[PDB]
Amino acid sequence: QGVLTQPSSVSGSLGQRVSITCSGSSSNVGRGYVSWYQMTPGSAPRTLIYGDTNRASGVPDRFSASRSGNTATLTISSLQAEDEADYFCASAEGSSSNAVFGSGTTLTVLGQPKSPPSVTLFPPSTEELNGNKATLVCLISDFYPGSVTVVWKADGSTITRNVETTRASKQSNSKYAASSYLSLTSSDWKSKGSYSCEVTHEGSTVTKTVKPSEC
Template identity: 30%
Template sequence: MITIFCAFFSLLTCVSGVTVVTQSPLITVRKGEQAKLDCNLGTVTDKSARWYKQTPGGVPQYMLRFYHDWSSVEYGSGFSAPKFTSTHSSKSDYSLIINNVDVDDFAVYYCKTWDSSVLPLESETVESFCTSEDVTCITVVFGQGTKLNVIDFPLTPPVLTLLSPSTEALKESKATLVCLAEDISVALVHVTWSVNGRSVTDGVWSSPTEKQQDKTFKMSSYLTVESSDWMDNADFSCEVSVGSKFTKKSISVSQC
């Protein structure tokens, strides 16, 4: 038997018509509180939701899985009740509950499910297991992850600087805008770029946060666009959020 395996979070295999697993991008809670991380399995209603924890620089750890027909949660090594549990509000809506959160819970949490209704092609956030004998595939789909910040101090909005493309860069077909975020009070942030009020993800790359001597963090995010889009006087915006606090900056060629 030959088995084809797409590595964890790799781009080696994708699928056509695969369900989309949706998670909130960022949650910030105070130390000692309860964190509730939601996951929607899309069109999948007959499979369990499985959760993984990944600390910065670490490998994903299997935490637990839960199915709406089960009476109890199945746990991975090192995870147990009452600290960790899972609930559901429908056959496709699940939640990971972390009680009495501590700084060790600071991580990115990924939700995963199975979708057997599609054929293997190409996608992101997918593992695919197929046999050459019967061409039966199990498509494993991941959400994009929820960043969990744990704080014991008041949050403050980050300070942003939005830089336009350089004159030299505009001579090429592509141009890059830079969003510098400083005085960030937590290590995990959520960055959103928009053009004329519409959110964009193509051409976006964001660096990890970097801790400073004053214990704040800084990071950079980049948006690469067609030079003609910039010269057409479109409005470009960068927003960086940390929990309920955020800062948004906008720029266009007419402002430069």
């Protein structure tokens, strides 16, 4: 029933002191056996802290925690690259088998310089078109920070129907990627002079175009 509320986002630079709060009620946090968990990209959670303050085996001692009243705090003393991750508190409530996890915090490590998106726009394959289908694929890479918006156009007018766009995801090189798909019939594809994928990144737009007559 209870809610453990955390900040949605925290950030800092390498080596900075960063804290994450976990506010509950006297029936959960206030009872003083708070635990903390880290979830790194594409890994199962790992336990960081238990019993408000104890550190799990193998966890670096830049991580510490404490509690005052109905608020528990996790502190990282010197922010490290590997600390970019999601963090969750938890507590029992009224029963040791009724666990409440907190709402979760995403921690980002700042440092990366700004980088614009590379954009590649692929037209539908002949093979797909044979099936009376046309998918245009806009692939977006190597941008930072991880925030782009995508607008599709046919002959300079905006199309919204049958578009699916991903959110940004972290690449192995610590920049971001995203993709967008526009699903058309083969007839709609052929009927237009040109289609465009227009990607905006913090106010600056990179546009790619394909013309059915050339593709």
